[PDB]
Amino acid sequence: YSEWITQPNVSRTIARELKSFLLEYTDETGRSVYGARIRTLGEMNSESLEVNYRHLAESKAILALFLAKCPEEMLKIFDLVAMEATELHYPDYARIH
Amino acid sequence: MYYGISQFSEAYNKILRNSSSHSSCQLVIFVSCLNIDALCATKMLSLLFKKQLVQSQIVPIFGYSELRRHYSQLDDNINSLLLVGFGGVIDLEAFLEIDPQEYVIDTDSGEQSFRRDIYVLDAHRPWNLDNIFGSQIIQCFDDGTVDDTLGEQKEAYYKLLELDRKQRKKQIHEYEGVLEEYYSQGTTVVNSISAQIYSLLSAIGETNLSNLWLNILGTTSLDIAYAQVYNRLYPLLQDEVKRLTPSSRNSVKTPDTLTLNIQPDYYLFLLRHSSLYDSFYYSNYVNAKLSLWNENGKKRLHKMFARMGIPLSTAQETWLYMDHSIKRELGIIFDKNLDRYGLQDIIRDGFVRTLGYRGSISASEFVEALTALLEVGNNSAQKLTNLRKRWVSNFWLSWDALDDRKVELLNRGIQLAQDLQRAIFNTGVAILEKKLIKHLRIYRLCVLQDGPDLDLYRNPLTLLRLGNWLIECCAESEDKQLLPMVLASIDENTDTYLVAGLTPRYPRGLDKKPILNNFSMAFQQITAETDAKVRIDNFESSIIEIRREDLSPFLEKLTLSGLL
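ok -> structure tokens follow
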């Protein structure tokens, strides 16, 4: 699996995939989950984003499989994606963490 | 009218002719304490009389009762008084029990002269017309309002005075109609007393950066309650800053350089002494816009700093040690963001003074320090008097803080200002969370029955801090109608409520004609009708104090009145 995650086309695809997941997965109210969690993350000036795995297993479940079988590579990618998502949400959050 | 702004020189020349000598003290200044603008005007005036070496006495006075006492014990050698920051809105010739024939001398000619002058330096309106026209002894320093506005009332006063049949009936009914429509106007401040003294200093040729700074301070003290007057006066202050600023450029900061810039002076609370976070958090306007008295507004303020790219720990640093790059970039960081939260009126240019190497201070911060020193600086009638004595004594801590030699006293003022605003804020969230503000049909009512820091609000200026904090919050809401407010607070020691009648006002950024305070005469009418025991001697006559048992009948009679 790690040999697959580290293939650069696969890596770039995975980055787009997780970004799409964060921006489009919602509560049954239609409210974006990680939109609201990122909003809260910045308000707390936190370095941590709590991604619920069951959400990732509901949509783009292959990424949940890679995350289970190969977390060290996947979490590096997902960290970059999460920073991208919150930098999109808050400009210059790179100054805070 | 009595002395127009073109002829303040003539009144000052009359002062030096009558009541100046090496021989004796002859000039008394009564100044209303608990008034920053009156304080700054008196400081400017005292520097003038020091330079001209005029022997004089300053008396700080709380209210009209002490005024009548202190006037009564003046010796005939005192042939000029200056009344600063009060007295224009009451018939002083009647109230001080003047008979002009007791003071008249040297008629020759259809003419008179008098053994004592009473010059009045007051910015409150409507003028009492017995002062402006009736009296020959009272001498008001007019801003131009009389000549601009009161021609009909002038004609009505003189014709009614002349008019000791059908024509007689018509005329007397007409001019009583005019005068009883001019009176029962709500009270309002139209100028800064300090700017009037500054115009006098311009006439005499006495302007300098010290007197200009005092004028800036006295004018800046009006900004919270009387925003339109501050906006009227601000261009003239810019002119004078540029006229008196030196010609040097690339001026290296040097321990002797007094500098007085116009520069961005945001509408945050004690920015250069607070942290950044606290200067947002304890600002009246920020609290009003964000509804910061609840956790959602608190979340919004955190959201703002996060979006600005400011770490919260940096935001909470005391401003001197707060990151230099942020301090350079702050104007950009605000410009990019504060419209996004509707806080765009935070952006402002204001007067900032920095002397040598000992920091920078805006007029906003400086008046906050001075007010805090007035508020918290140092059997019932005796206890009340011993409290008013503390406030008369607090005047001299604000006075001495105006001197650069005593900046440790200014730092006392800064610290007291922070802790006072904290007390105001906690009382405010108590009021709004427990929903104390009862919405009576004509006006909103808020009565503090109990709570921490209750023993501060027996001071009028602290009560007005809380009133202004409330009024900004109500004004910046969309759902609420703009209505007058009564704020009251029990003193458990004297067993009397101190009660303040407060105007509403528009949102801070909007622009319409001014709103007047009509609690000033409504309280008088209820006082005149009632058997209750209520004191109405404060110079800010929209403030009264009343026994606890009498309040609810008083408020019931007030809300039955149509005058508000």
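The longest helix of chain B spans residues 407-433.
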